[PDB]
Design a protein around this ligand. Sequence first.
Ligand SMILES: [Cl-]
Ligand SMILES: [Cl-]
Ligand SMILES: [Cl-]
Lengths: 81, 83, 111, 108, 96, 94, 99, 98
Amino acid sequence: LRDNIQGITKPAIRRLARRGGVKRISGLIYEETRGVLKVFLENVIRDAVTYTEHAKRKTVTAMDVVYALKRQGRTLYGFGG
Amino acid sequence: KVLRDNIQGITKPAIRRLARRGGVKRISGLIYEETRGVLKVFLENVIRDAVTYTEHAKRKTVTAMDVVYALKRQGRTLYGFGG
Amino acid sequence: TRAKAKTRSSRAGLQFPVGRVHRLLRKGNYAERVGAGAPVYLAAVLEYLTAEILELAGNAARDNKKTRIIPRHLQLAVRNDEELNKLLGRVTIAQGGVLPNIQSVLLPKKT
Amino acid sequence: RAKAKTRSSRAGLQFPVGRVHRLLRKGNYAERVGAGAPVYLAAVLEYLTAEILELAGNAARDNKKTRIIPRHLQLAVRNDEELNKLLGRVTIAQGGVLPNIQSVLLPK
Amino acid sequence: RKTRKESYAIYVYKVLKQVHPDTGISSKAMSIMNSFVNDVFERIAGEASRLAHYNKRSTITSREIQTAVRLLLPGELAKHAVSEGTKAVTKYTSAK
Amino acid sequence: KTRKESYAIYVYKVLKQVHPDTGISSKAMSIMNSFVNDVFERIAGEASRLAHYNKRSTITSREIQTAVRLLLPGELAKHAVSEGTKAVTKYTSA
Amino acid sequence: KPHRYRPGTVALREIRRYQKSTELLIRKLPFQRLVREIAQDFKTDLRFQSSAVMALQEASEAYLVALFEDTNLCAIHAKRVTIMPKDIQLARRIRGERA
Amino acid sequence: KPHRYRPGTVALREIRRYQKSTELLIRKLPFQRLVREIAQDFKTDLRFQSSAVMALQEASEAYLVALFEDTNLCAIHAKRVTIMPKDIQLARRIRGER
Ligand SMILES: [Cl-]
Ligand SMILES: [Cl-]
Ligand SMILES: [Cl-]
């Protein structure tokens, strides 16, 4: 239950960087990117779980993640709204 | 009288003082024109919103509350003049 | 009553519902009183923005030789327009990706 | 015929529960507004005001002053990490910035 | 089992047919347009409510929505939307 | 003249409760009043949004608690939830 | 006899291929495991809708693609074509996320 | 010849002096003229409270100081101590105002 951040693989971060337009990727990128992604997911899942707590539910709906991302100024379309 | 050429009123030493408060050691020469441009576009957006708030308030004097509401709306909340 | 029930959408020459907009302005807890010019005007604004974006998205569907607007076409429709980019710069559209943007220094020197 | 005990003193607080309550009513937030809501909210506001005025009195003491100026609020918020997270997109007037000098700009 | 979640889906489709009569739209893109309409709606009604609280008013009329549009839409998009809105409010106030 | 309300004397009261000898200027008083108004509007905003999300029309202490847990980062959230639950106990048992 | 390309050409080819595609680049199940792992430290026995994890993945990949865009601009600005954690830290610092 | 300092020492001295001070660095009256000039292209005969122009100046100087902070970080990142319009454009691009 600790190698789940390693599930964000080196090919997957490379594909993401290719979509971002990156030509060359140093080796120290990948651990840093796993870290930054983990911090972003910490903030988002923290807010979404807070919203789940307020609704007295046990499951996290997609509307909760939409409301969380909307609160954090990154509005997401296509999941209700 | 139509006011013109007031962007030059943001003088070179004032931009240098602003650079010093930002921690800048050395300043190239095109910084001053670029900075006058960026400050002009910033004041364009902010004064545009404040003028809009004046328009809807049926007034002709831009209050400090209008500029506070405008800066706050753009995600830069200014303390000291209300809100 | 004995009258033809002409809806406020058709009365204003619009398509978006003035009644649903009006009862969302009432239920949404924005003010005590909500007029009729407010939901008429707001349905007009929303119809115009929906019209312009679905227009640009049909254009990008035509360019992609398709007759069904996908998320990617909305993505291209918003991000290739400057003012829609200013409107939705802090907004993620799902299943859209990004624009095909490649910087000039990353290209090989084909001279 | 009863002693008019205010809800601030009833809740053991200082910020007015009545003014917070009528701003929650007037402010068009919901149809109904409780009493635990303005009590809790006055408590939160009093705690944040307490913490910031504490750090600001500390920065006034460090500056050998007994009157809190804007600069002292500036230092109180920006030298704390979580108050910086709270007010990252917030400008405090007459405050300036922190005395921050980068390491590579210093002479060797 | 009786719960109807409201949407703008038929109205987005009607405006699409009134713009591109031969071009359809998927349900994911319909959801994205629905959430865009809901979002812009909330933005304009938000700004209008804020303006009404600012100016010590309790009645949202077309003028509040108008200056909220002039604030929220960037420039020429705001000019076209204020024109389209004032045209529809003119047509509304002088109809059958 | 219509009285423009403020939190100024309450900021002075809490300042004496945290620094009995340290005063405060009027511009710093304006900055504290604006901070209090701002954070008030933030929490009441997020709480109104919370009530609207959950199809409710009553703002109770739970909506304000979840709003404070959203807006205040980490330890500010935990200490404000502690102080607020303390004051709501002190209110309901007085 | 075995053919081999230069690095830049397959790199640019992948840049084009993934800027044309729209599919999710992180796999679904390890991202789901990461989401459950991060959630675990907030409340035990949490459940997730499938569309919730899909929304998390859409926003996370879009966030990292905008991050790598800014990171590439930092690299190009520093007369490089190779991104570095220097560039990621500069990007996040200018965006205001260093907290 | 009289005494003359190195550039870095007076530069760092001014960096220290102005990061300690709190006063407005742009002068009041040319900023006021700039505000009236920009306002002129929105409505003729606009009036301004003094505290409104002071609020504009506080926010404008704070914005430009945060801009020069990000610009200095761009310069330092590019192995330079000189800020450039390259650095200003990179800062505004990453911040999202381009
Ligand atoms: Cl009206
Ligand atoms: Cl309650
Ligand atoms: Cl590095």
